[PDB]
Ligand binder design. Structure first.
Ligand SMILES: *P(=O)(O)CNC(=O)OCc1ccccc1
Length: 257
């Protein structure tokens, strides 16, 4: 189905960027529009830490205190005044979408400053990390704070994971979390054919029914993933997202590959 027609049908704005890393073939829809990325950056944050810490060192520990906790920290909440390994941080962040794990991660990398630095080095001058969790979820169509374009975000994932500097194991560790993650089930995982493997990281901003899904999609018989970035929003601040919109956009995009 047409992407515009999906916009119409679901009464929403869609931004799509798809790269078959095999062919170099891109699918684009509103790919230069800014959208709040939300928890989808947990993926980006996670990869960056992993370029600086070999798999064998994930056993390293970080001390968590009451000052570390932010809302929606289903895992980290139990670690107050405790230590956690880098490995468990990442798993908390990617699997349960733990906000505190994401924040400690950004810290480990060295701050937003360092994330931002790293992005420019990948040639990403678009992705705009400004706040920590959970504030970064406070989206305004009038602020560029914590937003990116489907195209810049999509090129970043590609340079970071798909064709990056990650070790084999790290790469696999991250990707295994994206595959197993059960939170993205209604998203991209629900729109592609039965055959494909879907490594996703979903997101949801607080405002304007900001519902996202990024993935490394593996068509049966293909070992190279299609990078798929789906950013969505609505016109009203208080609008509720419909997951079906993404499943359906995913399905439409799959057709081109
Ligand atoms: P990620 O899952 O996208 C981080 N988002 C988050 O922690 O909260 C956003 C939120 C809170 C309440 C309702 C809708 C979205």
């Amino acid at each position: 189905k047409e992407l515009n027609d999906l916009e119409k049908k679901y009464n929403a704005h869609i931004g799509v960027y798809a790269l078959d890393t095999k062919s170099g073939k891109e699918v684009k829809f509103n790919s230069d529009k800014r959208f709040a990325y939300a928890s989808t950056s947990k993926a980006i944050n996670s990869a960056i830490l992993l370029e600086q810490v070999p798999y064998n060192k994930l056993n390293k520990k970080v001390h968590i205190n009451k000052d570390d906790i932010v809302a929606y920290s289903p895992i980290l909440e139990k670690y107050v005044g405790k230590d956690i390994t880098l490995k468990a941080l990442i798993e908390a962040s990617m699997t349960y979408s733990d906000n505190t794990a994401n924040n400690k991660i950004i810290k480990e990398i060295g701050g937003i400053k360092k994330v931002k630095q790293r992005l420019k080095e990948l040639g990403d001058k678009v992705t705009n990390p400004v706040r920590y969790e959970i504030e970064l979820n406070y989206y305004s169509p009038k602020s560029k704070k914590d937003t990116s374009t489907p195209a810049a975000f999509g090129k970043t994932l590609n340079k970071l994971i798909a064709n990056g500097k990650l070790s084999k194991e790290n790469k696999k560790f991250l990707l295994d979390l994206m595959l197993n993650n059960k939170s993205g089930d209604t998203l991209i995982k629900d729109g592609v054919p039965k055959d494909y493997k879907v490594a996703d990281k979903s997101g949801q901003a607080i405002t304007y029914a900001s519902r996202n899904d990024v993935a490394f999609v593996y068509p049966k018989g293909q070992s190279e993933p299609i990078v798929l970035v789906i950013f969505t929003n609505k016109d009203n601040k208080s609008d509720k997202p419909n997951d079906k919109l993404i499943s359906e956009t995913a399905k439409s995009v799959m057709k081109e590959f």
